[PDB]
Amino acid sequence: MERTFLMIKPDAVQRNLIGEVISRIERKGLKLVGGKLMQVPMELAETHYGEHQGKPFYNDLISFITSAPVFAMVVEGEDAVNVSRHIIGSTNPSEASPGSIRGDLGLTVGRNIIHGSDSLESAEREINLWFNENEITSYASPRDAWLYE
C-alpha cells in the first residue's frame, strides 16, 4: 500500500502541537507505520532539502530544521501522498485552506508546521533517507475494512 514521508517541524514541536497534528493525520484514515522523535543531523538536513540548495530560503531552512527536534513519520494509505498534501494544505499557511493543518495552525511559509512528500518519487527517496526498513512496521488495523472497498 502507498506510503508517504511526513515530518512535524521544530515550530510544531516547540509549540506543543505534536498530538494535535498526529490527531488530524490519524482521523483522516492514514495509518502511522513509522514514527520517531529525533534531532536532525546536518548531513541528513542538507541531503533532504538538496533540491532547494541555491535558493534564498536555504541557509535558514537548514538551521531551522536543525534547531529543535522533529517528529519523522511514515504514513500508509490509499493515495497517501496526495491525501496527506490535501490535509496539510498549501505551502503558504495564508493560502492554505481553513481546516488544513497549515491553514489552522501556521502563520508564515517558513514556519509551516509540517512537511509531506510532494510525489511518489520523493516519498520513496525521503522514506529511505530517514528510515531503515526495520523501523517501519506493517500491521492490519480494525478500521482497514471500513476505509476501503
Ligand SMILES: O=c1ccn([C@@H]2O[C@H](COP(=O)(O)OP(=O)(O)O)[C@@H](O)[C@H]2O)c(=O)[nH]1
Ligand atoms: O518561499 C518559500 C518557499 C518554501 N519555503 C520553505 O521550504 C519548504 C519547502 O518548500 P516547498 O514549496 O517546496 O514544499 P512544501 O513545504 O509545500 O511541502 C517549505 O515547507 C517552507 O518552509 C520558504 O521558507 N519560503
Ligand SMILES: [Mg+2]
Ligand atoms: Mg505543499
